Design a protein around this ligand. Sequence first.
Ligand code: HEM
Ligand code: HEM
Lengths: 145, 145
Amino acid sequence: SVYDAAAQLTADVKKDLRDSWKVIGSDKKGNGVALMTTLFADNQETIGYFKRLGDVSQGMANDKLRGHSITLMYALQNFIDQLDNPDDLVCVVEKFAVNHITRKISAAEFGKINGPIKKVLASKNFGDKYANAWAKLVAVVQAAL
Amino acid sequence: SVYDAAAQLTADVKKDLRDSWKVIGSDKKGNGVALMTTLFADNQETIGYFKRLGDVSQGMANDKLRGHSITLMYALQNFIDQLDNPDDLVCVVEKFAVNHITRKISAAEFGKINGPIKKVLASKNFGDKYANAWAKLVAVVQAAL
Ligand code: HEM
Ligand code: HEM
């Protein structure tokens, strides 16, 4: 269950999630857009899912993409703040899961976000240990998909 | 015009928004649910729109409502953080506006949130002064509906 995946997050993992988010989460617009653009560059097959955002090749200049990217970072902000209370993390995760379930996004496709996250983390010098930590949080969402 | 509405957020308005948010935003789950139940309590005709959340009269015991309430508080957190930049405030406002436009929520019905906001603010000892400041921010979203 989602609760099982959440309840597994250990103190060391939560520590790595928090320390890396302190940095990346401090520039939500910059790092959020970078995440989305990286996803489109490495997984061109997903572009079709974001037709509402218009021309995503426009990057920062695209207001719809910018608004979406900033908002996405707050979803992660939400997750990070709920880490110490699995019950709350679970209810917020299931809420966002519905958003993607309605767009027919499978657990497998959602995991495509791990590659981009790893690259963004790297640009700030956060290594594999940190990428692995974020992979675990993403798995919580996957458990709901 | 969402842009003209955003221009209404003068230095004094932004200050009152930040000051009051420091207190209310500190307990997103509590004040978030308080906001929603007050809305359902004072405006029973809006309850129909929240069909997916199930039985809202259960309040805090309703996971879906709790997950929704917390997320809503993060939307407000988003707005507050974008106050310095009207271009970014506008693109995030329009993003959330789309979420409600699709739900057939008009500018007038969205305005019904002003009542609950004034009440939640009052219970924390923040008067009309702060309630009006928040009506200004809500007005920005209304301009995009
Ligand atoms: C860390 C990972 C991710 C987070 C936290 C996240 C967060 C979000 C948020 C907050 C929204 C807005 C939901 C709404 O208001 O309707 C959204 C929309 C969406 N997401 Fe994700 N997402 C992530 C990964 C992905 C991935 C990997 C895909 C695709 C394989 C995906 C596909 C979509 C689609 C299609 C939309 C709708 C866009 C639109 O039409 O506005 N998401 N996401
Ligand atoms: C302070 C003002 C408000 C804010 C910041 C706000 C924020 C939000 C957020 C973040 C969502 C989730 C978006 C999604 O995942 O699709 C949402 C959904 C929704 N909102 Fe609002 N909202 C506000 C006021 C209202 C009011 C006054 C109404 C009704 C008259 C309304 C009706 C809805 C409905 C029907 C949904 C869909 C709930 C669901 O099925 O999950 N909102 N709102």
